[PDB]
Every structure is written in C-alpha cells, then in structure tokens.
Design a protein around this nucleic acid. Structure first.
Ligand code: MG
Ligand code: MG
Ligand code: MG
Ligand code: MG
Ligand code: MG
Ligand code: MG
Ligand code: MG
Ligand code: MG
Ligand code: MG
Ligand code: MG
Ligand code: MG
Ligand code: MG
Ligand code: MG
Ligand code: MG
Ligand code: MG
Ligand code: MG
Ligand code: MG
Ligand code: MG
Ligand code: MG
Ligand code: MG
Ligand code: MG
Ligand code: MG
Ligand code: MG
Ligand code: MG
Ligand code: MG
Ligand code: MG
Ligand code: MG
Ligand code: MG
Ligand code: MG
Ligand code: MG
Ligand code: MG
Ligand code: MG
Ligand code: MG
Ligand code: MG
Ligand code: MG
Ligand code: MG
Ligand code: MG
Ligand code: MG
Lengths: 203, 38, 207, 53, 246
RNA sequence: CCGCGGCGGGUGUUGACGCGAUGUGAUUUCUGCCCAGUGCUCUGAAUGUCAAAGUGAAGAAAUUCAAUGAAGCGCGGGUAA
RNA sequence: CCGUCUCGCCCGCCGCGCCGGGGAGGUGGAGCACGAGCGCACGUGUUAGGACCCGAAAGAUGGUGAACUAUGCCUGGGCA
RNA sequence: AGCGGCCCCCGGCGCGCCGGGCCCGGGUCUUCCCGGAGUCGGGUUGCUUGGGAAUGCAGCCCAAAGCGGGUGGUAAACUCC
RNA sequence: CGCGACCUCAGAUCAGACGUGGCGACCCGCUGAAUUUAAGCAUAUUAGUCAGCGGAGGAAAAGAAACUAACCAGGAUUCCCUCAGUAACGGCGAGUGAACAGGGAAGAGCCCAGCGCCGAAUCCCCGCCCCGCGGCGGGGCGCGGGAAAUGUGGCGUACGGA
C-alpha cells in the first residue's frame, strides 16, 4: 500500500522534496550530540525490510561519524623506512564508515546485540546513520520461537568480528572467479591452506 | 616477553575456586541432593 | 653457484616454513574414529539403507569426460512430476531432490523415470502403527524379511552396446573423410565473409 | 619430520613371503636357526582340525 | 638534526609565563543598559600596582543597580589620577580624564587609550607604558570612524566601541640604560624565560643552520623567504630593504 | 611556534616604550666605492613557457585535434650594519 | 615427419570458391628408422632452508627511567 | 585374566493410562498478484591480488533502470544465443 | 490565565533484569614494519609475516547461487589427493604463483519484508486461588492495569503462489 511507494519516494533523492527534507533534517541533527536515542525510526520502509518488528525490545539510536580517510599517526614526517612506505596523506581505510558507526554504537551499549544499520543524511564533513539494537533477555524476544537465535552466546558483538552486512563487503567474499582468494573460511585460511607443507608419512 | 607471563599466571597461586570447579564438573554440577541418610 | 651441467630449478622455501608444518601422525587413529562413528550410525537406523538415498544418473561435461555416467546430487522436478511422486514425500522415503537441474535431452529423463520405477518395486515400506496399515503399506510377511543394504544402492555402472561384423558397402570406399574435416574447418571459418560479400554485391548491383 | 617410515613394493612383500615359506620345510635351515628339532617325525607338521576345540 | 630552540618554545612546558603574583587581568567594564543611555559613578579605591609587568593598574568600585552589592573592577591608570576621584562611565559622560565614553561621540584629535577593536571585548589596544592613539575622522553614514595607532598605521573602527581618555601612565621607561646585567636578570626573572640569548654562529651545525665551521661566519644569506619550512625560518624573515637608513 | 586528531594548545591574566627572529660587542672615534652575480622583495595581461577541469569539431564509439590558460619561475624596477 | 622460402603442373565436390588436396629441389628441429621405462633402498656432488661450529659496526616494533646531573617554577633555611 | 559376582547413584530410550493442545490433505480445469535504491554502474586517487587498457576492497564528485540488470578473463560500437 | 492531549526530553538509593575484568594453544575482524636475498641498490622480495589493538567459542568462520562450461552438459559450504610448481605476473633479472573439471570423506535443508485476505485474530507485567516447582512453568479467573493502525499474529517466498 504505502510501503511500496514510500520506497519509490526514497529514491527521488535529487528531487525538490527530498532536497528539502534533508536540507532540514541534517541541520536538526547537527545541533544534537553524536549518539542519542530516537523513539521511532525516520524510515519505516527501510526499517522493516531488515527485521525491525514494531514491538517491545527493539531500540533505535542515531550516531554521527566524521568523514575522510586516515593519515598515519606518526610525528612530523619521519616514517622511517624505504621510500615505498612514506605515504601519509592519501591513505584509505579498509572498512566502511557504516561499520565504524555500528561498532561505536555497539561498544558503548554492551548489553545489547546489533542487528543492522542504515543511512539518513550527509553534510560536507558528516555522515549520519541509524542503528537497530535488540534486548537479548527480554521476555518478548525470548519466547519467540523464530528469533531466539540472538540470545545464544555465539552472536556476541557481531560487529567486531565482522558479520554485519557492512563488514561482509569488506571481507571480500562470495562465489565465482571474482572471489578466488577467499576459498575456505576467509582470506587468511585461504593463505594457510596454501603456504604450508603437507608432509605425509611415506611421501 | 614470554618469560614475564609465567611469573604471573593462573597456575601459580591457590586457585581457590578453580580447584573446586575442576572437582564439581565431573558430577555435572549437582546441588541439592545428599548421599543416602543412614 | 651452479656447476657444469645441472638443471635450473627454483625451490619455494625462502619463507618460514618450519612454523606451519602439517604432520600426519593422526591418520591411523582417525580411520578408527570414522569407523566407529559410521558403525554406530549404521546401528541407529537399523533397517534403513546405510549409504544415503538413491542418486540420479548424470553425464559429465568437458569433452575429456563426456563419455561417462556418474552419480549426482538429486532428482529434478520433472522426474518427479512424471513419476507421480510429491516433492516432499520423496524427501521422507529416501529420495534425493535438488531443484537446480534442467533437462535439455529426453533419453536421460526416461532412464531416470525407469530407475524410480525399479526402486518403487523394490521398496519395503513399514507400517506406522504396527497394528494398522494404509492402502499402500506392506504386509506382515515382508517385515520379518526386512534387512539392510550395505553399499551404494543400485550402483551406477557404465554399459556399452556391442555390434557384430557387418559387410562393407561398395559406397563407403568412396567417402573422403579428411577433405571433409578440412572443408568443415574452412566453411566454419568463412561464414561471415561469404555472407557479407553477397550483401556488398546486392548494394552494388542496383546500378 | 625426519623421514621415519618406508614403503616397499607389493610384489616384493609377496616374494618374501614365498621365500620364507619355502624354507620352513628343510630340517637343516631349522636346526641351524637354533631350535630343538631332533625328534619331530615330519617337518611340514599337519595336525587335525580338533585343536581349535 | 636536533630541534632548534625556536622549534621548542611552542610546547608550553618551560617557557610559560609566571602568573603567580599577578594581581588580575586589566579588563574594562562591560556593556549594559546604563552604558547605552546614561552613565554611572566609580569611586576609585586604590592604585594597587603590579610591577609584575611594568604598567600601573587601578581599583575602580561601582554601585551595581540590579542586586544589592558592589561590583569591583580594574582599569589601566591614565596620567594624573588621584586617590578618590569620581570616575564616571557611559555614553552621556562628560569629557575629562578617567572617564570612558564611546568613540563616535568624541571630537577629532583626541588622545585616547585602551580602545576596543570590536564594539565590545573589554579593552585590547594601546595600553602599554606611554602610548596613545588618535581619533582621525568620523563618518555619519555607515557609522565608522578612522583612527591612527602608535605604530604609524591607520585603521577603520566602527563608531560604537569605547575608549578611556588620556595617555597611559608610566611613560619614559625606555631610558635609563640597564648598564648592569643582572638588573635585566631580575626583569626577566619575572614574566618569562628567554633572556640569555646565544647567537647562532657559536652553535654547532646540528641545532642551527647558520652555525658550524672554523671561522665564525654564515655562508648562507641571512635573508629568507616566508614560504619556508619551520626551522629554516631563522634569519631575516622578509625584506623590502636591509641596511643603513637613519 | 607546537601537534596523529577537533571550535585543539603555548607565547597571552599579552597589544608596537609590546611580542618574536638575527648579526655585532663598553664608552670616546670613525664607519668608504660596487646591485653585474647567488639570494630577497615589488609593477605585473607590459607577455615567451606553463596540469587537472570545464569547451568546441571530425568519427559507430573508445579516441584524436584545436581555443583559452592560476601561482611560480622568465623579462623590468628597488636593496650591501 | 613439422616449420619456412623459390620454380610450376594436374585432381577432387550436397555445398563450384580469395575452397580443399597433391609434386621436385635446397635450408631450421631437443625427432622416427622393430621399444626401455616405473616404483623402492644405498652412495657421492651441486644447490634452497639458522646449514661445518663461534664472531661483528648497525637497522626496526613495543615499553621502563630526571633518587645522580641539566633549566624553569612553588616553599622554607644560611653568610665573622 | 574372565559376557566373573555384589552394593549404590544418574540417565538414554521403550509401555500404560490420567491431562491439555491442533481439525489441517490431493487432482484436474477457469479468473487474479508477484519482489530488497546514495545502493548497481561510471570516472578518479591509493593500498592490494597470479589477474595482465585496471580481480577485489576503501574514499571523493556524478547517479540510474523494468521484454530490465550483472557475468560470459583485451579496451570500443552494432548485433544473436 | 485555566483545565485538559499526543508529541520531543530529563531526574530518582523507584520495581525487576542485564553487561564491564581474566585465560589467550586453535579462531574471525582491523593495523603492519626492518634485518635478509638480488653478489651494489631505490620498484620488487623478506610479508599481508613478528610486535601492537579489539572480540568470542568447545569448536569459530563460510553457505543454499546476481555459480561454474560451451560439453550429449553439471548443481549448497568445508576437508584430503590431483590439476601445478603449470596459464600468468616481474629492473620479464633474482624470484612469487591460482582456480574449474574428475575420483573420494560428510551429507539436510530453510524462514521473513513487500503484494493481499481474516472485526488487533497479537504480546508482556500486575492480582487471587489450585498443581508442580534446587533449569520458575501449565490450565482456570480477573468492568485490574499497560505497549501496538509510523502495523502485532495466522496462511505465504521464486522449486511458482493464492
Ligand atoms: Mg622498496
Ligand atoms: Mg558477508
Ligand atoms: Mg665451487
Ligand atoms: Mg664551540
Ligand atoms: Mg642542518
Ligand atoms: Mg668565503
Ligand atoms: Mg648587527
Ligand atoms: Mg649582488
Ligand atoms: Mg653436478
Ligand atoms: Mg652446510
Ligand atoms: Mg640500511
Ligand atoms: Mg629532584
Ligand atoms: Mg634558568
Ligand atoms: Mg603485490
Ligand atoms: Mg566500500
Ligand atoms: Mg576477451
Ligand atoms: Mg557479444
Ligand atoms: Mg533500584
Ligand atoms: Mg603497507
Ligand atoms: Mg644486498
Ligand atoms: Mg653479500
Ligand atoms: Mg648495503
Ligand atoms: Mg604474498
Ligand atoms: Mg609491499
Ligand atoms: Mg598488511
Ligand atoms: Mg601478532
Ligand atoms: Mg573479554
Ligand atoms: Mg568457556
Ligand atoms: Mg557458525
Ligand atoms: Mg552464518
Ligand atoms: Mg537460489
Ligand atoms: Mg562452481
Ligand atoms: Mg608435472
Ligand atoms: Mg636485466
Ligand atoms: Mg572441483
Ligand atoms: Mg559416508
Ligand atoms: Mg511466517
Ligand atoms: Mg508479513
């Protein structure tokens, strides 16, 4: 009904409506702090396509992250070494800013377990997001038979080990000829299976 | 310095709870019950 | 510092290899572990087949191997719609089903439907409650003769037809084979130019 | 990871068995090995099947 | 290369200012409704003086019209201030010494001090021992006013700030040569620590670019461009001339 | 001037009789000529050379070629405690 | 026998062509010309790995020290 | 040593009921509905991989589409599968 | 200036719940060098390696295709043999170096959002009683109170479905 075409409204991002609602919301968000709780999600369309059922237990934060690359934390220049490894300015970070935002809002509230994240607004020097957090031990999450997989102790801190969809891109995996070098578990054991000598008994 | 750990690790002192967990494990952490009263 | 005459060679040991060395002293104490976890699996299901449900007959790709027939993943859904079996009962009687298979031919569709019709006539089906059957269950006779089947069920075997010794026609003496292989190579390389110069002549002949 | 084990062919393992069975029949290659076989009445000594009982 | 001393005064560790004995910040009085429509009376209580730095202060006590209390202040003393002298302060204020009144109202050619570069920031210009700025002109539209500074330069200030009237007391300090050495030492035992300057030729070449060598000489030109790295910017900083004009 | 970093920090509770950077070495006495060089600075469409971008044309297109062209070096004045 | 150049003649055909095939003469090749390899064990020799044992002047990551001495500070003490 | 014995304890799983829960399936034909959006992809700079007119990842600007989209190991258009 | 209501937002020694630090043999995410080799040495190699930092478990990760091949075609992931020291990169020098197919171990598959229909058909907590309760649960009652129409449950997910 509406959720099919709020969806198709939230890809008129160049239009005059969404250029107004962002030229307002990014300002409202800029006078707040870096990590605060909102009572309801700004996008319900995108919120429900990830698992946000509107019951007791689910929490939504809102955090800002500054923008740019990462220059190497050394003194003045002085990166001692061969002239390959001089580079300080133009370096680029491996994981995205979206899973920076997830684990900044996943360590400060350690009693909760992260589900997923999404986008809201952008400035010149700021990228805003939304996050979805779940109480592990509340009785509504607990007695659901479908989704009591979270409370198991395996899924602690999904975001530091890289399991959210924002870190699954950084790991570099899938299927095909395009993803040769992550056969096995990951990129590391695709190195470990290779660079060892299997020394048989009889050889 | 793998030598400065073994000056200060777990196997050093008393283990005043771990040595009675290594004992309770082998009966499945029973509570409550008693041997038969005679 | 090579001497007079030996082969050149490049050993891959400039890395630190002594740290990651996989020994194999486990091996005669893991063939016993797998032997116990397979026989205690073979005694949990006492009359069922030990080697998994039956598995379809499939050729092989890549012209090196395209003359063999080996085992597969599971049956398709044409080999079950024709054979009249519902696609979630076949999971419960020991029939492997994968929904990701096509059928571009016909002569393997038929030989799979025929193999199912063999297995359906070999299958001894026990009653749910041993006091009351269904229309299609089996009698109290075969229950006493029900036993296991060790090994892959109905093993897949490569068969070859034979031919006797015919008499050679007067015609086949006049069949030049090599000037036909090198005609089909030339005809398979000149399919575009022959069909383009005729078009250019059809643009030139209006004059 | 010194190379502990060795392998030998099959048809030499079977040639050694045939060349160790063919010399448990002479009463000289048994006495010189060291046993005490002065009195045994027959060297391929075959006894009935009721010893398994 | 070792870090030269100019690359070492910007840490903030041992070159800090001695702020123990300093009696207080020589501010001015704020803005309010009364300093925009009328005036208000001060009762100067003493001329307590910090020769921590070398300019005399002033204790000025005001009657505060909001609560029942007496606000104290501080100022910089002009020339010829008594002890007990009713200092007025505002915009309707009459024009004599000690009073402080806006720039837009005083006439042209009036010797002032302690100007505010911006219409309120409680005093930032021409407050040293014996200096004075002069009001040059006015402009009724766009509400501005020119003034000449004691350097020689000129500047445009909006005609809404405030300024006391009179020069800074404490003039003539640059005479009486310090013929002694440790009498400059007791001068810089106060505020801060930079006095025993060691010239650059005497040094080794690892802490000053000019130094090193057998003969005490420079070799390189003392004049240097401004678009320069830190630690080379040691000589004459930028040149329009370098010589003997008197 | 510091510093991996921000509305960061010292000088600065400071304001040209003040901060900061240099060469000489009391007073008395004098401090000469040279701006071609290497530096430094100022007038720069007074212009020879000068990237990315944005522009035009030919091509099926990837492309290819043209106009224009910031600082700075070049050219022109000032400067030897 | 394959690669490559020179001279020049006939034959083939569901497709008739910038199609396909054939000869004689010199040249390049780790090739045929009635097999000789595979798997195991031992020996010497050359090498890659800490590599016959002992030996540097240095180079890098991550941490501990102003109780001696170097300078600024706070607070106190002494000089017939 | 031995399918030798005895005495305890906790289960795995088999059967009787006594309780509550849930009334659900095929085949054959007519009419309806059917998908994830600052992401795909494009330019660029930097690390990387065996990946070579650029495999993956990350950053900045530009920014889509429904007989549509990506892949089909040499860049580019027109084509068919 | 009133009584009122949804919204945004605070405080409490409010009721009941939770996480924080350690071990660190194996594991996943980031960050990441130099000796050394090339008879010098700066791209390379040494190495996605030591050190450094944060997270878990009895095993962790991966995973039911935006897949391989051009065959008469296979059909989730991991693991061993093999392809292979090969196609390729590289002051084309020193040197680094994959996968698909084939035979085998193990064998297991699935659910939501949207599109729509059933009168919020939905949970959690407080109250009283009965049973059992050393892993706090079931049935009966609550004009006893709360969250949800910015969407709670049932059918239903690409093998077509209603
Ligand atoms: Mg290098
Ligand atoms: Mg992933
Ligand atoms: Mg030699
Ligand atoms: Mg000296
Ligand atoms: Mg130097
Ligand atoms: Mg000289
Ligand atoms: Mg001088
Ligand atoms: Mg000169
Ligand atoms: Mg040799
Ligand atoms: Mg050796
Ligand atoms: Mg070196
Ligand atoms: Mg001390
Ligand atoms: Mg000192
Ligand atoms: Mg590389
Ligand atoms: Mg990215
Ligand atoms: Mg290609
Ligand atoms: Mg194509
Ligand atoms: Mg409490
Ligand atoms: Mg690096
Ligand atoms: Mg070398
Ligand atoms: Mg050497
Ligand atoms: Mg060297
Ligand atoms: Mg590598
Ligand atoms: Mg590298
Ligand atoms: Mg790395
Ligand atoms: Mg490490
Ligand atoms: Mg921990
Ligand atoms: Mg544990
Ligand atoms: Mg897992
Ligand atoms: Mg998983
Ligand atoms: Mg699929
Ligand atoms: Mg594949
Ligand atoms: Mg080989
Ligand atoms: Mg070379
Ligand atoms: Mg394979
Ligand atoms: Mg098996
Ligand atoms: Mg459902
Ligand atoms: Mg739904």
């Amino acid at each position: 009904g509406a959720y099919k075409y709020i969806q198709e409204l939230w890809r008129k991002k160049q239009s005059d409506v969404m250029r107004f609602l962002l030229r307002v919301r990014c300002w409202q968000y800029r006078q707040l702090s870096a990590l605060h709780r909102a009572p309801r999600p700004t996008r319900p369309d995108k919120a429900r396509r990830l698992g946000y059922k509107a019951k007791q237990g689910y929490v939504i934060y809102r955090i800002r992250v500054r923008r740019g690359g990462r220059k190497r934390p050394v003194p003045k220049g002085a990166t001692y070494g061969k002239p390959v490894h001089h580079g300080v300015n133009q370096l680029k970070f491996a994981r995205s800013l979206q899973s920076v935002a997830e684990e900044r809002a996943g360590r400060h509230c350690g009693a909760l377990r992260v589900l997923n994240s999404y986008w809201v607004g952008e400035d010149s020097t700021y990228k805003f997001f939304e996050v979805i957090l779940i109480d592990p031990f509340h009785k509504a999450i607990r007695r659901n038979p479908d989704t009591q997989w979270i409370t198991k102790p395996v899924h602690k801190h999904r975001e530091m080990r890289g399991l959210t969809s924002a870190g699954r891109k950084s790991r570099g995996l899938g299927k095909g000829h395009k993803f040769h070098h992550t056969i096995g578990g990951s990129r590391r054991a695709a190195w470990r299976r290779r660079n060892t000598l299997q020394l048989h008994r009889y050889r | 310095s793998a030598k400065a750990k073994r000056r200060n690790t777990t196997g050093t002192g008393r283990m005043r709870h771990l040595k009675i967990v290594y004992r309770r494990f082998r009966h499945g952490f029973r509570e409550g019950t008693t041997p038969k009263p005679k | 510092a090579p001497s007079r005459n030996g082969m050149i060679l490049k050993p891959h040991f400039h890395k630190d290899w002594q740290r990651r060395v996989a020994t194999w002293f486990n091996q005669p104490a893991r063939k016993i572990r797998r032997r116990k976890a397979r026989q205690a699996r073979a005694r949990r299901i006492a009359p069922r087949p030990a080697a998994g449900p039956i598995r379809p007959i499939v050729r092989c790709p890549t012209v090196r191997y395209h003359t063999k027939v080996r085992a597969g993943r599971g049956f398709s859904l044409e080999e079950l719609r024709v054979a009249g079996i519902h696609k979630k009962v076949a999971r419960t009687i020991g029939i492997s089903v994968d929904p990701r298979r096509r059928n571009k031919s016909t002569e393997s569709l038929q030989a799979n439907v025929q193999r199912l019709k063999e297995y359906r006539s070999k299958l001894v089906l026990f009653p749910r409650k041993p006091s009351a059957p269904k229309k299609g269950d089996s009698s109290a006779e075969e229950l006493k003769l029900a036993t296991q089947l060790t090994g892959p069920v109905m093993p897949i075997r490569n068969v070859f037809k034979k031919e006797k010794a015919r008499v050679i026609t007067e015609e086949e003496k006049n069949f030049k084979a090599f000037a036909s292989l090198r005609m089909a190579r030339a005809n398979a390389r000149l399919f575009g130019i022959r069909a383009k110069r005729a078009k250019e002549a059809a643009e030139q002949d209006v004059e | 990871w010194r190379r502990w084990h060795r392998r030998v062919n099959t048809t030499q393992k079977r040639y050694a068995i045939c060349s160790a069975l063919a010399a448990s029949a002479l009463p000289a290659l048994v006495m010189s090995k060291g046993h005490r076989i002065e009195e045994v009445p027959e060297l391929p000594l075959v006894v009935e099947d009721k010893v398994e009982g | 290369g070792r870090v030269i001393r100019g690359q070492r005064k910007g840490a903030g560790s041992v070159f800090r200012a001695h702020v123990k004995h300093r009696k207080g910040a020589a501010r001015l009085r704020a803005v309010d409704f009364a300093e925009r429509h009328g005036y208000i009376k001060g009762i100067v209580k003493d001329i307590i003086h910090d020769p921590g730095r070398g300019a005399p202060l002033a204790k000025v006590v005001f009657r505060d019209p909001y609560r029942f209390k007496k606000r104290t202040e501080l100022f910089i003393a002009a020339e010829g201030i008594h002890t007990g002298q009713f200092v007025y302060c505002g915009k309707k204020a009459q024009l004599n010494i000690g009073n402080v009144l806006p720039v837009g109202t005083m006439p042209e050619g009036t010797i002032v001090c302690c100007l505010e570069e911006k219409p309120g920031d409680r005093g930032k210009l021409a407050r040293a021992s014996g200096n004075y700025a002069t009001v040059i002109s006015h402009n009724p539209e766009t509400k501005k006013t020119r003034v000449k500074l004691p350097s020689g330069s000129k500047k445009v200030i909006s005609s809404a700030n405030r300024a006391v009237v009179g020069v800074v007391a404490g003039g003539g300090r640059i005479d009486k040569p310090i013929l002694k050495a440790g009498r400059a030492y007791h001068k810089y035992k106060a505020k801060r620590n930079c006095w025993p300057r060691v010239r650059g030729v005497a040094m080794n070449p690892v802490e000053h670019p000019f130094g090193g060598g057998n003969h005490q000489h420079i070799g390189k030109p003392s004049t240097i461009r401004r678009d320069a790295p830190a630690g080379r910017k040691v000589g004459l900083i930028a040149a329009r001339r370098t010589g003997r004009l008197r």
